[PDB]
Ligand binder design. Sequence first.
Ligand SMILES: NC(=O)c1ccc[n+]([C@@H]2O[C@H](COP(=O)([O-])OP(=O)(O)OC[C@H]3O[C@@H](n4cnc5c(N)ncnc54)[C@H](O)[C@@H]3O)[C@@H](O)[C@H]2O)c1
Ligand SMILES: NC(=O)c1ccc[n+]([C@@H]2O[C@H](COP(=O)([O-])OP(=O)(O)OC[C@H]3O[C@@H](n4cnc5c(N)ncnc54)[C@H](O)[C@@H]3O)[C@@H](O)[C@H]2O)c1
Ligand SMILES: NC(=O)c1ccc[n+]([C@@H]2O[C@H](COP(=O)([O-])OP(=O)(O)OC[C@H]3O[C@@H](n4cnc5c(N)ncnc54)[C@H](O)[C@@H]3O)[C@@H](O)[C@H]2O)c1
Ligand SMILES: NC(=O)c1ccc[n+]([C@@H]2O[C@H](COP(=O)([O-])OP(=O)(O)OC[C@H]3O[C@@H](n4cnc5c(N)ncnc54)[C@H](O)[C@@H]3O)[C@@H](O)[C@H]2O)c1
Lengths: 255, 255, 255, 255
Amino acid sequence: MKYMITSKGDEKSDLLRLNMIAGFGEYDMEYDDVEPEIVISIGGDGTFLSAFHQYEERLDEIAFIGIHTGFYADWRPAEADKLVKLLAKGEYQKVSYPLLKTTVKYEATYLALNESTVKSSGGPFVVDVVINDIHFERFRGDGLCMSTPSGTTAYNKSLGGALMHPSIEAMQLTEMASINNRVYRTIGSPLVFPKHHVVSLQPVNDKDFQISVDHLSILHRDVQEIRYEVSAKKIHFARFRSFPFWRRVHDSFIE
Amino acid sequence: MKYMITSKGDEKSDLLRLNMIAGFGEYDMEYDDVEPEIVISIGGDGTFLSAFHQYEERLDEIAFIGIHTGFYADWRPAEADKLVKLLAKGEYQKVSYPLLKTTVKYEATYLALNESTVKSSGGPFVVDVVINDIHFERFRGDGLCMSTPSGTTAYNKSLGGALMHPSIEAMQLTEMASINNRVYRTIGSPLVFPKHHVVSLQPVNDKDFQISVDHLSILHRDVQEIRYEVSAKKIHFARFRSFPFWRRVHDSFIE
Amino acid sequence: MKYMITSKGDEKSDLLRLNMIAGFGEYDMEYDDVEPEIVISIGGDGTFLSAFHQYEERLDEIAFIGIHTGFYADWRPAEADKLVKLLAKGEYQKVSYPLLKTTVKYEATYLALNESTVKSSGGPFVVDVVINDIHFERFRGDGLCMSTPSGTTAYNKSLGGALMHPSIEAMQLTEMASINNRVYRTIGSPLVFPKHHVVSLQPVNDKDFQISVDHLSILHRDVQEIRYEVSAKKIHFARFRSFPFWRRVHDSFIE
Amino acid sequence: MKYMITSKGDEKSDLLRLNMIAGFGEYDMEYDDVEPEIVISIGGDGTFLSAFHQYEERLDEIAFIGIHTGFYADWRPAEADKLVKLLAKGEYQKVSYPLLKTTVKYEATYLALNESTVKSSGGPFVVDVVINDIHFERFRGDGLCMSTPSGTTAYNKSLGGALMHPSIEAMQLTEMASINNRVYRTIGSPLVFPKHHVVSLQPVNDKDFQISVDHLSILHRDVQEIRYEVSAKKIHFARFRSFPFWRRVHDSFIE
Ligand SMILES: NC(=O)c1ccc[n+]([C@@H]2O[C@H](COP(=O)([O-])OP(=O)(O)OC[C@H]3O[C@@H](n4cnc5c(N)ncnc54)[C@H](O)[C@@H]3O)[C@@H](O)[C@H]2O)c1
Ligand SMILES: NC(=O)c1ccc[n+]([C@@H]2O[C@H](COP(=O)([O-])OP(=O)(O)OC[C@H]3O[C@@H](n4cnc5c(N)ncnc54)[C@H](O)[C@@H]3O)[C@@H](O)[C@H]2O)c1
Ligand SMILES: NC(=O)c1ccc[n+]([C@@H]2O[C@H](COP(=O)([O-])OP(=O)(O)OC[C@H]3O[C@@H](n4cnc5c(N)ncnc54)[C@H](O)[C@@H]3O)[C@@H](O)[C@H]2O)c1
Ligand SMILES: NC(=O)c1ccc[n+]([C@@H]2O[C@H](COP(=O)([O-])OP(=O)(O)OC[C@H]3O[C@@H](n4cnc5c(N)ncnc54)[C@H](O)[C@@H]3O)[C@@H](O)[C@H]2O)c1
């Protein structure tokens, strides 16, 4: 089947990609970076994120695999030949993780695999947080982060967020340095939203925001609304062997 | 239909219960505290918790309503006559929240509407946390809290936990004063588990634990295992009008 | 004695300043915004911060008073005539709060009354934290905040910092969204440093930083070192009546 | 000079103590556990805490040394012979850390080297926090912890407290699972108090408290007041070589 391999671009990753390409050549197994059914990323989570964003229009057609030279991998370099062989035989099942939809109105829509965050253009950050049309809080602070379940181990975690198992179709909102006093009040806790709940951020002053979607960070001017919802689209991973999310978490954070 | 009313036992709550009983007398609408289809609690969340635990064997037969003299209410005293009338007409729909199953092996099983917590008998607290048979961490600290989604606003919140919408069938584990240094390591983040994930606590030293289930707190001796799972049983509420969970959260925590 | 009055610039503050100027005219009591012995700020803490930075070269000659139209005030508008009279009689004692020295080497030196923070130019933020020449941690995250004792109620608080009584000559370092995993480690706790302890931040990648000092925020390029120490200089307040720091904290945060 | 050695009581610690006693026998250097000038603790911080509490009446006469078989040590077993020799020559300087005074009125007074905490007898915990006679907050939650500067790395840290350098004569109050909503309010931040500030805890309901002082935990009945102040007494350590507090912190928490 059709496949491609992205690389981090250092000497180790490129050489490992070339050797895999040669290994796939022994099967067949066409290399195609236009319309692949399998996308292999060799590098770190940054590389994997770039891979995902490179093919975010063909998510329903692709299964992703990651090699870690690393949360979204999966595979070590020395196991790469085993991977070539298993991938060749099609000895794998597919696992789907939920994604986050960000809509910015002035409409621009973005997909996040990890999170989408909002900060001012610098800038005291003040927004009204509206949940399913109900005014929930006026947030004052450094910014806000909306994470997918697989993103919960990333920026979310650093902000005091809960780790959520990715079989849960949800998104989680965390505060960055919220101001709380006698006058200003936020909830001061992460919030976990189900699919079909809509969280809207509305400007108070100040309509210019620095908006991130995974690695991408761009200044948006004249914003009327930032809207979050769990996406209808999912990312598919190829697997291969049991590597439970909680084991993956243990390995990345405990030992 | 059959109904009963529990009261906090102060003068305001009892008098309000008597007046409701008289109001229900005008319809019919039998009072029955043995096998009711409707349980009305007048007091605070403590009263509501007692009401739930009083009828935890007939959860699939009962719809609960709360009057707040108050997170699980619902109703103010001055609206009580409206409630009598709407309840009388059956002008209501049913909402279900998920519950937590606690199993203690030496088997004793408990249902929690809010949370189940574990602390030592005093006592350095040290347990191994096992998730679906995988050893995740050795927890050292003051204790652990496992919360339902509606419990997330209670003890969970105080411990840095996320608020979860109760349409999500999950349970959330929070740490109490975890010790983290060069030698001792916990995840240091709340964890959100889906239905059918099992979290087991296993003793390291020390087999005596103070175990709470909502209001109930009992010392357990010679414990082999404490097991958490999202219950197959649900609590049903009667509603009546739109009062969204996030609005309820706003009202209790923001203003 | 010589005095000046700064104003927030809204209609209420200007009018209140004019009336005070007229009140001081009845005594004498020269207005002098070049070399004042007394600086009155009418507005909020922003106004007070601007006032402090306007005269940071004559700190040892000035006593500051704040009117709140407000943590650094002190006075309500309706009490302004009492203030004019007490100030006129010299019926006041002086209270001194410690300040923070920031040195940026490529040397630029800054004084902070609240805090000095560091973030990347955008930018993954990674610095080595060196304490009295000992390499303490490599910090990865969003940034760092170094606060004076009176700043502890501001940005510091939002970041999980302790509130310190300003009779303690210290500075306190807080983390912004620190990354902690199996590979990356920070202390994950605020740190309180005495006078004569030096905290140095050293670049790892990346030598461009966005550095804040109270309200001022500027991008610094080609940085070799950022150095923090409790300053030898102090801010003096005029007081007037007992208004204890902990009472001030209660009033701003509790009720 | 007069000395004694406490041991953890395992085979390694006892044998190491015997060998040190023999080493000291070669000098002289009388062993005296009644009125020693030097107290050596071999074990962990628990052993060191027991050593401190064993001689808390002769603190102004004793210098403490710790051997770690370990925050309050100082020394590894393999260095013990070097210690015997340096101690013998008197090649050491003295470092003093501040302590906490706890007073319980119904007066019982306790000294803490680490912390003094308060929880209910089980028991919703509710107390009024009074600072220098001013009513600061009504605390509702699991309990409170008051830490010395050297205790800041212990229970304090686990509760989100700041690490304070022990050259600062202070005490720090941290919350255990504080309840904060629309009705109930705490400061939600650690508080750092200078010497001569008095923090008083006053019962609201409920006059029975479980009070800890380092390792000691006792139920107190019919309490009118719990009073905290930085003690006039200090603990003295013998040193020997440079081992800075921040280095000690690095070694215990970073690597
Ligand atoms: N303070 C913070 O936690 C912080 C700040 C900014 C960005 N980020 C993260 O960086 C990501 C993208 O940046 P980049 O990779 O281009 O460079 P980067 O250096 O900013 O982030 C990469 C680091 O984050 C880790 N990471 C990425 N996804 C993860 C996941 N889901 N779980 C655990 N760790 C994960 C990577 O392994 C790597 O260590 C963003 O999606 C965001 O999550 C984190
Ligand atoms: N530090 C803490 O947050 C803490 C400590 C112990 C117990 N608790 C809570 O107390 C509950 C039962 O105790 P009790 O009611 O018999 O007496 P209690 O005084 O210990 O708790 C009652 C308080 O908790 C509130 N509460 C109960 N359920 C809630 C919910 N789901 N969301 C928000 N607030 C809620 C009540 O309104 C009331 O203010 C437990 O289920 C536990 O959640 C909390
Ligand atoms: N997330 C945050 O807490 C955050 C983010 C950026 C800046 N700041 C603060 O803003 C200050 C200066 O900004 P500005 O005033 O020009 O505009 P600003 O809007 O960014 O900050 C002003 C707000 O902070 C409050 N404040 C200032 N000093 C305080 C103090 N010591 N204690 C308690 N509250 C205090 C003011 O009363 C006002 O509500 C900085 O010194 C920094 O402390 C805070
Ligand atoms: N969640 C918690 O952090 C927690 C809970 C209860 C007690 N404690 C601590 O335990 C201490 C006494 O108990 P124990 O030693 O008899 O048995 P213990 O097991 O309860 O505590 C001993 C542990 O705490 C560490 N410790 C002691 N003092 C320390 C210090 N100042 N800095 C860093 N770590 C330190 C020890 O090295 C050891 O790992 C108390 O003083 C309290 O600080 C901590």
